[PDB]
């Protein structure tokens, strides 16, 4: 029995997977309330398959959040937070002292209301924050595995998040600030800068008690040169006119560096420039 | 003085015309606009100075065609890839000719100085809003101040003749013994605001500075450190002065952003790249400048893609 909050690509994609196997999944929706209470959500995928998600109910055991505190303000008697960023858990934990942290690896995009496009990957890593794996976590993971994707229960979700942040913190903002370059163009022409950012992330992770594998920077460089030219999720958001994950990726990494006094000038630079681009993008037609 | 202006660009035409007004004999090499400039001259519109019709002493297709060779040759093009300043000067410089380079950027002199080691190089730092609106049509919109000095340093009689002329013409003409330190002092401002104006998708100076003052300061402090390490230390107050002055200036659109919006080549390399390279040569830690520079180059790469795809 599963409560999803909101109807974005991530919440809808993982909600619909749990709906497939045969769990009782509802959605709390705002922007798309009218369209989902009727037509539902259509998940389209060539690696998995086509499926349609019609929830058990639509109102205004496990709650998937994917105004955070307030969105769960009447939903908790396991909380599952699926996020691409870092340090997304403390705020929520403090208010509801089980938190299941979810780190998704997936190229999935919401093309229209009720319309999701799965392209690549799909893995969901899950574990308790700050660490640990409970039975619920294992049961959730098995549930996702059943539905077809990697559903990995991990005892060190926070280190895993830092490890993904090595890649995210470099390519996501560079793809936007460059005006839309793919990963291959970014890495092949400014490998040095990409490395400098990655090493900063590595040093902040360690300073926060979550050291990463020793050759993590070289691994991410080598693996990216083998990925086919790629469009980041930040760039998709930017091209869609939607809010970007700047704060939970890069802002949270910067604040983590400041707290531990790690020199992070490359991260500070990219962050400031993202904030400036956002300010420009934010300007009202009203002036 | 016998003055030769290379081309019919806005900066050359503006400062050339001032020299003509003040009794100097000013000639022009014109490619594109030859017939109209030779027949009708260059019309300079200016609210602050009064409109002026600049009729060159001579207008030629090629410097080769001149009779009296110039005392000063004024070259004012943007220093970007393929500008080929040495090629443009090849026939326009005699033993005694002073080469006057008026352009933005740092370290713009050595390529020319090297190619003409026995000629005086007079470096110019203009603070001006001027545009070429049509063949033979220039519009002066703002500022005008020109600082001039010998490269690598000093002030020759020819430099002081030029400066006084500009001053007589109604703009600040400032002779400076340390033009290179002056260039570094301008770089403190333009290496921060010019690329931040473009990378932000077109913010004005006040939005940049009010919302990211810490980052702007960080950049400026790097530039100040690189200048010192290159033997051109700046005043202790230069960062504070630049921040205060900018807070008091009306919101402003940088020349880099003007270029970006126009689809014209930007001065990335002479403003930012040359500062980065000067910092690298001297082992100054410049992570903010390196970051901004790498992002500029990535943006430039994107900007160069075809509508047709690969």
UniProtKB/TrEMBL annotation, chain A:
One of its GO terms (molecular function) is 2-dehydropantoate 2-reductase activity. Pathway: Cofactor biosynthesis; (R)-pantothenate biosynthesis; (R)-pantoate from 3-methyl-2-oxobutanoate: step 2/2. GO terms for cellular component: cytoplasm. The keyword Calcium does not apply. Residues 156-278 form the Ketopantoate reductase C-terminal domain. It catalyses: (R)-pantoate + NADP(+) = 2-dehydropantoate + NADPH + H(+). It is an enzyme of class 1 (oxidoreductase). This is 2-dehydropantoate 2-reductase. It comes from Methylococcus capsulatus (strain ATCC 33009 / NCIMB 11132 / Bath).
Automatic annotation (TrEMBL), chain B:
Keywords: NADP, Oxidoreductase, Pantothenate biosynthesis. Its EC number is 1.1.1.169. It catalyses: (R)-pantoate + NADP(+) = 2-dehydropantoate + NADPH + H(+). It comes from Methylococcus capsulatus (strain ATCC 33009 / NCIMB 11132 / Bath). The lineage of its organism: Bacteria, Pseudomonadati, Pseudomonadota, Gammaproteobacteria, Methylococcales. GO terms for biological process: pantothenate biosynthetic process. InterPro entries: 6-PGluconate_DH-like_C_sf, 6PGD_dom2, ApbA, KPA_reductase, KPR-Related, KPR_N, NAD(P)-bd_dom_sf. Residues 3-152 form the Ketopantoate reductase N-terminal domain. One of its GO terms (cellular component) is cytoplasm. It is an enzyme of class 1 (oxidoreductase). Residues 178-300 form the Ketopantoate reductase C-terminal domain. Pfam families: ApbA, ApbA_C. This is 2-dehydropantoate 2-reductase. The gene is panE. Transmembrane segments: none annotated. Belongs to the ketopantoate reductase family. Pathway: Cofactor biosynthesis; (R)-pantothenate biosynthesis; (R)-pantoate from 3-methyl-2-oxobutanoate: step 2/2. GO terms for molecular function: 2-dehydropantoate 2-reductase activity. Catalyzes the NADPH-dependent reduction of ketopantoate into pantoic acid.
